[PDB]
Amino acid sequence: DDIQQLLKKINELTGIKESDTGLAPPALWDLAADKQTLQSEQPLQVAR
């Protein structure tokens, strides 16, 4: 029973993470990966 209750703690504290991908490495374009983005936002109204 202790082993069964210990597996739960171990996985709970090492849970499924590092899965929120979708981010290009802000190193190849790190320089532009910045306030330039905000400049992209605000102007350039999104059309339909």
Partner 1 sequence: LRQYYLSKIEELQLIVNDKSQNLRRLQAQRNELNAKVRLLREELQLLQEQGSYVGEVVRAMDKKKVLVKVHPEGKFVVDVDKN
For 33, residues 6+ apart whose C-beta sits below 8 A from its C-beta are 24, 26, 27
CB of 38 to partner 1, least distance (A): 20
**17 vs 35 by CB, closer to partner 1:** 17
CB of 20 to partner 1, least distance (A): 4
15 in contact with partner 1 (CB under 8 A): yes
C-alpha–C-alpha distance, residues 37 and 3, integer Å: 50
End-to-end CA distance of the chain: 59
Residues lying near partner 1 in the complex (CB under 8 A): 15-20
